[PDB]
């Protein structure tokens, strides 16, 4: 696959509908902990242990401590130059009547904080809740999300469970509900929102240029989306830190931090 920035820029200059698939690497360049992969732990657990319906069923306080920590951590994190290049791209192209959409698995909203408006968050958001009784989804940026979680969620091994009674965990504020809230994030073993998948398909079907950023095109989630773009003859450009593009078929591979390559690519 080509590494010619000048050739990519020629496609970019003509593209009227860009899909940008954004993976964990974009968030990692902002220092956002993912609690996945080697070394990434919260206390003695990884996300595979806590981001599950079973974990929440048995230990909702521990799961809420985990997500509370991750919410509060965001107060010290900022979008990186990759987020900014992507947002600035959307803004500039939008004034020209050209579409940019970001499809991200990241749940930390740094794309939104950078100014991205056209955003499909396929794994949901740390800053949305869903009521386990009535289903309502709500924005929630409160620090702390409930009083009982103030000062909880410390990540250090040895930290004991807060063991907050479920009545004092975040509760639904719809009139006449009061049900127990969960984070509006996709957990292991769960379905994506079919409505989001429908929106994703529409974008993949109409785009004339696809970028895969901060992840590989041959693993989830990009592997679910990029192949059918490439099948239509649409160029796919990969921006990630792998030395070997674990793939041919795709037109471009640019190695490096997205905050180094994307400002130039999307200028």
């Amino acid at each position: 696959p080509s590494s010619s920035m000048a050739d990519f820029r020629k496609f970019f200059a003509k593209a009227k509908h860009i899909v940008i698939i954004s993976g964990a690497g974009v968030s990692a360049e902002s220092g956002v902990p993912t609690f996945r992969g080697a070394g990434g732990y919260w206390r003695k657990w990884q996300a595979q242990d806590l981001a599950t319906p079973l974990a929440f069923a048995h230990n909702p306080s521990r799961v809420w401590e985990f997500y509370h920590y991750r919410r509060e951590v965001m107060g010290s994190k900022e979008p990186n130059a990759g987020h900014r290049a992507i947002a600035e791209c959307e803004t500039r192209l939008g004034k020209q009547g050209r579409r940019v959409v970001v499809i991200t698995q990241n749940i930390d909203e740094l794309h939104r904080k950078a100014g991205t408006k056209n955003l499909l968050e396929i794994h949901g958001s740390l800053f949305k809740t869903r009521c386990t009784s009535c289903g309502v989804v709500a924005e929630n940026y409160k620090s702390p999300i409930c009083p009982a979680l103030s000062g909880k969620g410390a990540p250090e091994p040895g930290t004991q469970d807060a063991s907050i009674p479920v009545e004092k965990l975040p509760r639904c504020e719809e009139a006449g509900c009061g049900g127990l809230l969960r984070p509006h994030v996709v957990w292991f073993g769960e379905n994506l929102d079919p409505a989001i998948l429908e929106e994703v398909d529409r974008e993949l079907a109409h785009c004339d240029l696809c970028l895969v950023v901060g992840t590989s095109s041959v693993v989830y989630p990009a592997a679910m989306f990029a192949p059918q773009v490439a099948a239509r003859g649409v160029p796919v450009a990969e921006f990630n830190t792998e030395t070997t593009p674990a793939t041919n078929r795709f037109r471009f591979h640019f190695q490096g931090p997205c905050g180094t390559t994307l400002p130039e690519a999307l200028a």
Binding site: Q48, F188, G189, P221
Partner: peptide, 4 residues
Amino acid sequence: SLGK
């Protein structure tokens, strides 16, 4: 617990 898996890969999403």
